[PDB]
Design a protein around this ligand. Structure first.
Ligand code: HEM
Length: 295
């Protein structure tokens, strides 16, 4: 591999907590307003998916990809087959960026995910500013995001590239409490769980408690379906097939607070992988929800 690239965080000129809380608020207000999307699930889940896809390209071996450069705005990454459907999240963020043109693309994509998690009643995610747009030729090639038709050994190896351990993997996957698979996007179809747009630990409870059947969907792909009408990907279900993952699933199924704390740590880490924060950078921001502000 090549010598690691160095990506030093640089605060948008003159900006501070209050500026980023205003961007958060605009995202949160649009989440509330544009609530018809995807049969009234709203844009929360796709924004969290967008944050994972734009951060999940990172390669610890050469520090390519990751959230820093905001490269999803370029054709090669925008048109990654793995990114099908994310254009809806990008379009959601367009008026936000128009109102706050000074925020970097990487800061906006990652802050979109933080805002969505918190506004869906998830844990506070501390968030740092200072990602800087990088040129088109820094865009990572397609193929760095994970396949869903795979087992636990694949999941474990894949996430080593993001410097995630077993606990971080199981915690991050809890985001599949949110939203659904869409046959036209991914070859999988159905809601993951019951609430769809409230962040809870129901991913782990459903894995353990539902009666899952391995079925074939209308795209001829196998997926796990329950009589409650939920589905899980093969990679999701692998978390109760592998004995080490299963232990952690049981822990989170039995401790909502522990899941929230571990998810918040692993999600912040995901959004910050590859970034060098200078010694005198601002501390991470913890944004108030609209509810906490009375807005
Ligand atoms: C092995 C790892 C993962 C695999 C294979 C995977 C795969 C998928 C697939 C196939 C979909 C359906 C997309 C569609 O049809 O619209 C999806 C949706 C989603 N993913 Fe994952 N994912 C993984 C990890 C993650 C992580 C780590 C996060 C966030 C921390 C995340 C957040 C989401 C969300 C919120 C959705 C719902 C999107 C929507 O409703 O539009 N995923 N994932």
């Amino acid at each position: 591999s090549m010598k690691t690239l160095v990506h030093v965080a640089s605060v948008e000129k003159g900006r501070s907590y209050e500026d980023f809380q205003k961007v958060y608020n605009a995202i949160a207000l649009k989440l509330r307003e544009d609530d018809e999307y995807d049969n009234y699930i709203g844009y929360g889940p796709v924004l969290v998916r967008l944050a994972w896809h734009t951060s999940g390209t990172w390669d610890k071996h050469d520090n390519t990809g990751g959230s820093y450069g905001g490269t999803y705005r370029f054709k090669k990454e925008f048109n990654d087959p793995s990114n099908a459907g994310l254009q809806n999240g990008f379009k959601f963020l367009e008026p936000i960026h128009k109102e706050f043109p000074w925020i970097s693309s990487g800061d906006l994509f990652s802050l979109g995910g933080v805002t969505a998690v918190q506004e869906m009643q998830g844990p506070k995610i501390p968030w740092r500013c200072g990602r800087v747009d990088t040129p088109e030729d820094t865009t990572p090639d397609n193929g760095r995001l994970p396949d869903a038709d795979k087992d636990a050994d694949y999941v474990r190896t894949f996430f080593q590239r993001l410097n995630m351990n077993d606990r971080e993997v199981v915690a991050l996957m809890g985001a599949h409490a949110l939203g659904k698979t869409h046959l036209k996007n991914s070859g999988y179809e159905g809601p993951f769980g019951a609430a769809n747009n409230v962040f809870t630990n129901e991913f782990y409870l459903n894995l353990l408690n539902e009666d899952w059947k391995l079925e074939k969907n209308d795209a001829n792909n196998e997926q796990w379906d329950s009589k409650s009408g939920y589905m899980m990907l093969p990679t999701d279900y692998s978390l109760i097939q592998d004995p080490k993952y299963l232990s952690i699933v049981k822990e989170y199924a039995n401790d909502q607070d522990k899941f929230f704390k571990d998810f918040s740590k692993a999600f912040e880490k995901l959004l910050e992988n590859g970034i060098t924060f200078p010694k005198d950078a601002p501390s991470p921001f913890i944004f108030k929800t609209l509810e906490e502000q009375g807005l």
